Design a binder for these strands. Structure first.
Ligand code: K
Ligand code: K
Ligand code: K
Ligand code: K
Ligand code: K
Ligand code: K
Ligand code: MG
Ligand code: MG
Ligand code: MG
Ligand code: MG
Ligand code: MG
Ligand code: MG
Ligand code: MG
Ligand code: MG
Ligand code: MG
Ligand code: MG
Ligand code: MG
Ligand code: MG
Ligand code: MG
Ligand code: MG
Ligand code: MG
Ligand code: MG
Ligand code: MG
Ligand code: MG
Ligand code: MG
Lengths: 118, 206, 146, 65
RNA sequence: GGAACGAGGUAGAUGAAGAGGUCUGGAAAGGCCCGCCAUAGGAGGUAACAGCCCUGUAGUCAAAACUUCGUUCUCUCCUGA
RNA sequence: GACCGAUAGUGAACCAGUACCGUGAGGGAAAGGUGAAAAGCACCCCGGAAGGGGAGUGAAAGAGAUCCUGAAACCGUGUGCCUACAAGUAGUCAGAGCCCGUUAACGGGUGAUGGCGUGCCUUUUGUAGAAUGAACCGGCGAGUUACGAUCCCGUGCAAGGUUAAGCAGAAGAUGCGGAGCCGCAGCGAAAGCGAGUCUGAAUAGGGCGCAUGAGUACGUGGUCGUAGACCCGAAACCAGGUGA
RNA sequence: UAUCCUUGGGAGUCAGACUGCGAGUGAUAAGAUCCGUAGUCGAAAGGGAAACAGCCCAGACCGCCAGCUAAGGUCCCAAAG
RNA sequence: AACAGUGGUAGGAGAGCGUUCUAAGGGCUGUGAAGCCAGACCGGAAGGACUGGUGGAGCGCUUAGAAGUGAGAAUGCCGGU
């Protein structure tokens, strides 16, 4: 029996074009360039899901350093102080304190400072 | 195994012993599967063909010179990448039939008959004699025997009166003892065999 | 079995491999033939036993022997086969052929002396091995050549 | 169509009981002055086809019993 | 070369049984509830998918004329141990 | 009919060997569908007409003659968000603001700004490559079939296994058909001998075998042989014709 | 520590590249050429060397707005003296 | 359950998705089938549903079988733009 091309080809390509909504010009309209961009977007999305975890850690460290230097400590020494005091609060939470509850952050910073002066 | 021996009316006239060598064996499912595929393949007509690039009309000359035109090089307007061109491969007339070993054939039919007995779908009649060809008569007989879905009727010899009475009823097939076969028996839910026909079938298989 | 509940015996059937149907199949693109060269071409490859121009093995070696027109082949029967028969039977080639002990007569039946025979038989055959003749006679039988 | 036996090979090989191929030795035609008697004694005997070569040419002798 | 007869081919004939009730619907052949014919439940068509609406089908018949085959008869021919 | 269903199937579903092309031999297309029924839009309005807007017919006119369905490229109209200091393989991750409200989901649309980031394919030691291929969209377009060989797997029987043609039968199953084929015994070039046999002067040694045994029929799958043999592509060769 | 061998089925490969080390050819030139030896690439994404197949660190089944380290770094671009 | 592993070209092996047709069961459909057009749903992937719009008569599902069975590239062929 003969198998006509049928509707399978159009269905598959439409799915890709729907994933390409919002792409510029032909990249949301033409299957080949759309297909390339959707494939390329896949590699980028994977890469960036791993880069996300570095960018936010980078952001937290920057914020902690600013708040630390408001207590007369560099980030290096603050983190060393916390480790000596056994504090396991991570940089996401330290950054949160620095921004949302600065008094709490200073308490942790003072704890670190005690250990450093020991 | 023992089964009830009926008459056309539908009353039980006691029982009858079927030969265990034919109706009592453990159905070999694997050989039944093969028997069914083999038979259905043997029914295939296999009359299908396409035209390859040699058979398609025209296409002799080279569409254009090999070099210089800037077109892809082509050899014939009936190449398989051309619209209208020859098909690459595709259906060609062939037969699908093949043969199983005789013993596998016998094992298949024995398995299928013994399976009928396991499901209580084997109706044995003292005899089946119709006075005249009359579909009404046959339909009444089948209702008497509580035959609802398809049924295969197996007579010992050519029974013209029965064949004509049952010909027109959907899903009711009439067969001589010689003509019984795996696909027919498996297809039809009930097996109405006559006592005379049972011995003829046993004679061959046993 | 039901026509709507058919199952093949496990491992009796496999699905054919279809090459050149995309990357994910693993036989996409080059369809298992690697890259270029004679072996990858359609109807490619050299003839059986060709060695690239190195002299083929068969041509390096010398022909041997001849075929005898009058070559006789005997349907051989060992003593263990005769043991299947009953005592007092005269085992002729006609009896052997009918009972299916031998499939084909060829130039005749030859009895050979492999195995044991514990039955008195009147073996009639075209040829006997020295061992077979002794063994048939040793068990009280007769080994008549015919 | 039936596969055709390689007739040149049929004249050169012979199947053994276990399906190996028996062959003659090369260097057994002439120039025997240039070969030591030890070589000649040994080349006179038959040999078996190697595993490497057997797989290359097994199909050429398929029809041979 | 000629008759008689038989079976065919080249047109045709006849041919059973539900507008069943009801529900949607432009339109029932469909759904639901009931029947009936069948040697006929092949098929096509009919306002949606029909064994019971039409042409049909199974079955049984039909040829002025032409044509094919067959069997008998006529006719023709014929000694061999 | 486990054949095609309008790029398919005949080149030709249609006024097709036609149109067209060629001096000629010759080559050689494209092109199906209103509706159940023309009931094929009376009449009115704009217009020279075409084409429209009503009104009627119809179940439907968003079925009105290239008249079933009507995808994508492509061309437009309206606007919710953004856009005139910006360096862009155009996305992706982060992210306010504004606008919406879903297959109700740690929702949808847009995206100021930040980080990262040189298409796809082929061919290559190595290609973002300034090496090759693709204007775009759609359809079509490439390991198949027959017959043999071999291996794995499955099944039947098993020192046995199996029929071919053919004859009966639904173009079937099946029944009959044992001719033939493979295996159970091998060794030798052969005569021949035979669990041995060949070499040899040899009860010697050694080779190949046996003792240390499973084959066969059918089916599926892998590969191979012969066939165009995975598909496309030469420059040429030959044969018969057509042209001064 | 968990490979190795025999038999059989199916392959692909025969253009290699650079880096370190031991040599030849060359001029103790070449991103040159030809071998030995180890690695990486080829067929390997991630981090570093500004960019940079072959160098340094290290092997991506997948998610996380968690942590510790490698090479390399910590004045600003740009995480950290 | 524990432990271990899970980059990959040529290539080998396994398990699947989907398309057309057939058989057998069981269904859907004029109270609207296929196709087409949306959507924020589902599955590990190929993919599968549900709802609404269009459409106006055919089509799924389960098991098995058979293949003209899957396209983005061939200066591919044809059509449209
Ligand atoms: K190459
Ligand atoms: K169409
Ligand atoms: K295209
Ligand atoms: K002339
Ligand atoms: K390579
Ligand atoms: K609707
Ligand atoms: Mg296609
Ligand atoms: Mg031709
Ligand atoms: Mg691969
Ligand atoms: Mg290539
Ligand atoms: Mg040479
Ligand atoms: Mg009538
Ligand atoms: Mg009638
Ligand atoms: Mg309709
Ligand atoms: Mg056509
Ligand atoms: Mg219609
Ligand atoms: Mg190069
Ligand atoms: Mg090139
Ligand atoms: Mg180009
Ligand atoms: Mg170099
Ligand atoms: Mg690369
Ligand atoms: Mg890993
Ligand atoms: Mg640290
Ligand atoms: Mg900094
Ligand atoms: Mg195809």
């Amino acid at each position: 029996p003969r198998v006509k091309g049928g509707t399978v080809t159009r269905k598959r390509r439409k799915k890709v074009l729907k994933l390409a909504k919002g792409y510029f010009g032909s990249k949301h309209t033409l299957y080949k360039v759309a297909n390339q961009q959707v494939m390329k977007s896949g590699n980028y999305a994977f890469r960036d899901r791993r880069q996300k975890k570095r960018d936010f850690r980078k952001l937290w460290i920057t914020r902690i350093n600013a708040a630390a230097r408001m207590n007369g400590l560099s980030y290096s020494r603050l983190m060393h102080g916390l480790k000596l005091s056994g504090i396991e609060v991570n940089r996401k939470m330290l950054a949160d304190l620095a921004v949302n509850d600065l008094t709490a952050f200073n308490q942790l910073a003072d704890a670190a400072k005690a250990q450093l002066n020991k | 195994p023992k089964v009830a021996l009926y008459n056309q009316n539908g009353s039980t006239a006691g029982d009858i012993e079927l030969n265990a060598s034919v109706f009592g064996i453990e159905p070999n499912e694997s050989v039944v599967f093969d028997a069914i595929l083999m038979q259905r393949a043997s029914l295939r007509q296999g009359t299908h063909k396409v035209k390859n690039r040699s058979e398609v009309r025209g296409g002799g000359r080279k569409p254009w010179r090999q070099k210089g035109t800037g077109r892809a090089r082509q050899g014939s307007i009936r190449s398989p990448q051309w619209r209208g061109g020859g098909v690459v491969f595709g259906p060609t007339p062939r037969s699908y039939s093949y043969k199983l070993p005789k013993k596998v054939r016998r094992l298949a039919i024995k398995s299928v008959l013994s399976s009928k007995v396991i499901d209580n779908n084997i109706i044995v009649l003292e005899d089946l004699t119709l006075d005249t060809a009359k579909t009404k008569e046959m339909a009444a007989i089948l209702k008497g025997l509580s035959v609802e879905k398809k049924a295969l009727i197996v007579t010992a010899d050519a029974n013209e009166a029965v064949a004509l009475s049952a010909r027109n009823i959907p899903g009711v097939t009439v067969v001589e003892a010689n003509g019984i076969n795996v696909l027919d028996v498996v297809n039809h839910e009930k097996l109405l065999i006559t006592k005379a026909a049972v011995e003829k079938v046993e004679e061959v298989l046993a | 079995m039901k026509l709507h509940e058919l199952k093949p015996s496990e491992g009796s059937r496999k699905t054919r491999n279809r090459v050149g149907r995309g990357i994910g199949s693993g036989n996409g693109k080059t369809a298992g033939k690697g890259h270029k060269g004679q072996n990858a071409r359609s109807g490619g490859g050299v003839r059986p036993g060709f060695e690239g121009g190195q002299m083929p093995l068969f041509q390096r070696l010398p022909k041997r022997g001849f075929t005898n027109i009058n070559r006789k082949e005997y349907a051989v029967v060992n003593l263990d086969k005769l043991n299947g028969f009953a005592e007092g039977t005269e085992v002729t080639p006609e009896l052997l052929l009918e009972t299916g002990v031998i499939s084909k007569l060829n130039a005749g039946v030859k009895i050979l002396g492999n195995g044991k025979l514990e039955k008195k038989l009147t073996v009639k055959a075209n040829k006997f091995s020295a061992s077979a003749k002794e063994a048939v006679e040793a068990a009280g039988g007769t080994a008549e050549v015919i | 169509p039936k596969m055709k036996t390689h007739r040149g090979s049929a004249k050169r090989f012979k199947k053994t009981g276990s399906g190996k191929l028996k062959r003659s030795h090369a260097y057994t035609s002439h120039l025997f002055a240039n070969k030591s008697q030890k070589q000649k004694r040994k080349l006179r005997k038959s040999a078996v086809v190697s595993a490497g070569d057997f797989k290359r040419i097994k199909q050429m002798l398929a029809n041979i019993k």
